[PDB]
Amino acid sequence: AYKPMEGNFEEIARDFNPNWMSAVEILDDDNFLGAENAFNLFVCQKDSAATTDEERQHLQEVGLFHLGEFVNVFCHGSLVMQNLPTQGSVLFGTVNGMI
Amino acid sequence: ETAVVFQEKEGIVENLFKWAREADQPLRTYSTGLLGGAMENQDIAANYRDENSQLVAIVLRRLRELQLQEVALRQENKPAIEQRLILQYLTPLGEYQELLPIFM
């Protein structure tokens, strides 16, 4: 976190499972996407039923997927025309030229 | 020393909230420092890290009025032992986190 009235930082939460990171990107201020050296993707989620302080410092891995390719970059922004479906758009950059 | 405010007779921690927000003014005159051994303790400062933040809002507003009381009384030709003991409450728990926001 960052509490500007407190002048310091604060640990909201933390995932515990040892995944070797490659690239991270915030999706929608609730869900967090990450990349792994094992050529995989996963979304973590800030928890809701915060019945205690222990069940709200533990991020939950919601979703797992083997994108069989090493993700270096993440970025926002679509490649198509804004005509003003889905919500949001995250592109990624890899080691084999696979966007 | 430590434990008389910390023992199983621990309602006096909660009772001094009643004995500050609702007590008599000569009772409040000495009621403030009675949580001093609670605030010198780190555990009650951890067991009431947010419930004291109620009481800090009470005791700071009363603390401000003394400068409107005592200086304006001195501003007539041109009691603070409470204010002495009020600041004796705030001195241990002023160091801790998350109380600096209402301090600022």
UniProtKB/Swiss-Prot annotation, chain A:
Domain of life: Eukaryota
Subunit description: Component of the UV-DDB complex which includes DDB1 and DDB2; the heterodimer dimerizes to give rise to a heterotetramer when bound to damaged DNA. The UV-DDB complex interacts with monoubiquitinated histone H2A and binds to XPC via the DDB2 subunit. Component of numerous DCX (DDB1-CUL4-X-box) E3 ubiquitin-protein ligase complexes which consist of a core of DDB1, CUL4A or CUL4B and RBX1. DDB1 may recruit specific substrate targeting subunits to the DCX complex.
Name recorded for this polypeptide: DNA damage-binding protein 1
Family affiliation: Belongs to the DDB1 family.
Record text about domains: The core of the protein consists of three WD40 beta-propeller domains.
PTM remark: Phosphorylated by ABL1.
Annotated organism of origin: Homo sapiens (Human)
Function description: Protein, which is both involved in DNA repair and protein ubiquitination, as part of the UV-DDB complex and DCX (DDB1-CUL4-X-box) complexes, respectively. Core component of the UV-DDB complex (UV-damaged DNA-binding protein complex), a complex that recognizes UV-induced DNA damage and recruit proteins of the nucleotide excision repair pathway (the NER pathway) to initiate DNA repair. The UV-DDB complex preferentially binds to cyclobutane pyrimidine dimers (CPD), 6-4 photoproducts (6-4 PP), apurinic sites and short mismatches.
Annotated localization: Cytoplasm; Nucleus
Disease entry from the Swiss-Prot or TrEMBL record: White-Kernohan syndrome: An autosomal dominant disorder characterized by global developmental delay, variably impaired intellectual development, hypotonia, and characteristic facial features. Some patients may have genitourinary and skeletal abnormalities.
Curated annotation (Swiss-Prot), chain B:
Effect noted on mutating residue 78 to R: Abolishes serine/threonine-protein kinase kinase activity
Record field: transmembrane: none
Tissues in which the UniProt entry reports expression: Ubiquitously expressed.
Localisation: Cytoplasm; Nucleus; Cytoplasm, Cytoskeleton, Microtubule organizing center, Centrosome
Upregulating conditions: Up-regulated in a number of cancer cell lines (at protein level).
Top-level taxon of the source organism: Eukaryota
Function, as annotated: Acts both as a substrate recognition component of E3 ubiquitin-protein ligase complexes and as an atypical serine/threonine-protein kinase, playing key roles in various processes such as cell cycle, telomerase regulation and histone modification. Probable substrate-specific adapter of a DCX (DDB1-CUL4-X-box) E3 ubiquitin-protein ligase complex, named CUL4A-RBX1-DDB1-DCAF1/VPRBP complex, which mediates ubiquitination and proteasome-dependent degradation of proteins such as NF2. (Microbial infection) In case of infection by HIV-1 virus, it is recruited by HIV-1 Vpr in order to hijack the CUL4A-RBX1-DDB1-DCAF1/VPRBP function leading to arrest the cell cycle in G2 phase, and also to protect the viral protein from proteasomal degradation by another E3 ubiquitin ligase. The HIV-1 Vpr protein hijacks the CUL4A-RBX1-DDB1-DCAF1/VPRBP complex to promote ubiquitination and degradation of proteins such as TERT and ZIP/ZGPAT.
Annotated domain remarks: The protein kinase-like region mediates the threonine-protein kinase activity.
Assembly: Component of the DCX (DDB1-CUL4-X-box) E3 ubiquitin-protein ligase complex, named CUL4A-RBX1-DDB1-DCAF1/VPRBP complex. Interacts with DDB1; the interaction is direct. Also forms a ternary complex with DDA1 and DDB1. Interacts with NF2 (via FERM domain). Component of the EDVP complex, a E3 ligase complex containing DYRK2, EDD/UBR5, DDB1 and DCAF1. Interacts with DYRK2; the interaction is direct. Interacts with RAG1; the interaction is direct. Interacts with LLGL1 and LLGL2. Interacts with histone H3.
Family recorded in the similarity comment: Belongs to the VPRBP/DCAF1 family.
Protein name: DDB1- and CUL4-associated factor 1
